[PDB]
Design a protein around this ligand. Structure first.
Ligand code: ADE
Ligand code: SF4
Ligand code: CA
Length: 346
DNA sequence: AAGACGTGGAC
DNA sequence: GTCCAGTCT
């Protein structure tokens, strides 16, 4: 019922679509930025960040020209920071080799960093009307129920079948709305738990409702257990009130974000005190707390300490005043290190 | 193929 | 506690 569906869906969309910030216009830059911020992050959490981000980086060019350190700062607390580094590059590429005009050709836009199959379709379909499908988690949930597909949505293969299923039922007349409509539906109706089928605008066409198995779809593999990793962190202060920080390595975990000197303790303050060299003296642990990641959990332990000078501060390290820390981008884990330390000493 | 890659907010 | 939750390698 390719046509009956669209009509029922698109309409529901027209009257139920939320008035979200990135929906004010169809500007390719705005859309692209929100689509990237929304990856594995909830809309409510993204709204504030989006607004600040665009306020500070009004256009693709403004973003293109900004120092990456600023870019990270703007992303501070959002998670999966590699996303903004990829967007910063992609943009710099679009300014230089594309005349500041975001490609409207799948193959083209797709070569930019951070732009996978989903982004290509979301951005080009909503902003440029290109009929490419935009299949993400929500869409896969919706489609898997509508058509009763029981394949693991983890398999990129499934992503392709779902994508194929979109190429045949979408409303080629208005792809962008069809694609967002499908996404809103999964967001406000066809939810992960307790989907509201009784009031769904497309309940009809839903094989899953007919069979009473909607709450059992989509089929997903259960996440495995994550590694637990203890970490020693040093909060070193001068006599004048200056702390020691370093910029993490540009590749891997929390890439390019600043932090307080740390090291894996498989080791106590000994293992940490060693890494210092320097000229630092540490004492008993101020506190110990956890901090989860997708693939592991940090077992943190703070160690206070005085920093006596005796040489330059080079390498990744950097001497910084207290009224200047708030300018660096730190992971949520170390923002708590400082918070714990500051209330301790006060 | 499957692990790497943040962080928070419902149940 | 668990589920949610794209792209790069
Ligand atoms: N364009 C969009 N609008 C609302 N929620 C979304 N989640 C992912 N893309 C979205
Ligand atoms: S009927 Fe229920 S399960 Fe089917 S699409 Fe609508 S909300 Fe989703
Ligand atoms: Ca690509």
């Amino acid at each position: 019922p390719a046509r009956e569906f669209q009509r029922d869906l698109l309409d529901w969309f027209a009257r139920e679509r939320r008035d979200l910030p990135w929906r004010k216009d169809r500007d390719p830059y705005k859309v692209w930025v929100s689509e990237v911020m929304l990856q594995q992050t909830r809309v409510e959490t993204v709204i504030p960040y989006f607004e600040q981000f665009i306020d500070r980086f009004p256009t693709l060019e403004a973003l293109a020209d900004a120092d990456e350190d600023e870019v990270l700062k703007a992303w501070e607390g959002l998670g999966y920071y590699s996303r903004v580094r990829n967007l910063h590059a992609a943009v710099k590429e679009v300014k230089t080799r594309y005349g500041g005009k975001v490609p409207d050709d799948p193959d083209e836009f797709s070569r930019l960093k951070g732009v996978g199959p989903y982004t290509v379709g979301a951005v080009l379909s909503l902003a440029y009307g290109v009929p490419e499908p935009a299949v993400n988690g929500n869409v896969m949930r919706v489609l898997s129920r509508l058509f009763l597909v029981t394949d693991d949505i983890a398999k990129p293969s499934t992503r392709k079948r779902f994508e194929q299923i979109v190429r045949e039922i979408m409303a080629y007349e208005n792809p962008g709305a069809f694609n967002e409509a499908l996404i809103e539906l999964g967001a406000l109706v066809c939810t992960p738990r307790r989907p509201s089928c009784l009031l769904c605008p497309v309940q009809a066409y839903c094989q899953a409702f007919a069979e009473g198995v909607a709450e059992e779809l989509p089929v997903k593999m259960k996440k495995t257990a994550v590694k637990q990793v203890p970490l020693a962190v040093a909060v070193l202060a001068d006599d004048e009130g200056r702390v020691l920080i370093r910029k993490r390595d540009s590749t891997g975990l929390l890439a390019n974000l600043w932090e307080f000197p740390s090291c894996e303790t498989d080791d106590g303050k000994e293992k940490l005190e060693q890494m210092v060299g320097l000229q630092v003296e540490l004492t008993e642990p101020i506190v110990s707390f956890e901090h989860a990641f997708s693939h592991l959990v940090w077992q943190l332990t703070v160690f206070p300490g005085r920093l006596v000078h005796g040489g330059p501060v080079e390498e990744p390290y950097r001497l910084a005043p207290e009224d200047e820390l708030k300018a660096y981008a730190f992971p949520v884990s170390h923002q708590r290190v400082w918070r714990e330390y500051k209330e301790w000493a006060s």
